Design a protein that fits this description.
Belongs to the acyl carrier protein (ACP) family. The chain is mainly alpha-helical. The protein has one domain: Non-ribosomal Peptide Synthetase Peptidyl Carrier Protein, Chain A (Orthogonal Bundle), CATH 1.10.1200. It contains four helices and no strands. Helix 1 crosses helix 4. It is globular. The N and C termini lie close together (5 Å).
Amino acid sequence: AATQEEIVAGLAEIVNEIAGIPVEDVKLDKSFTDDLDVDSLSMVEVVVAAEERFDVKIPDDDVKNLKTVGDATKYILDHQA
């Protein structure tokens, strides 16, 4: 069970790798594909990476409803394992 910043940093590190949004930039108020820059395509791989680390499992489909780091974090934290 991760927490707000753990989900954030976790998503962020993956983002840093594929999309290129740095961990400082990825904050919960940040819409990955709007605030940050994330091409949303990276998000697909951020998903399988996040799902695997969080065990929460948020398909990119449900990820659409999580159009912000904090929204994702909200979902991911509430659904943590």
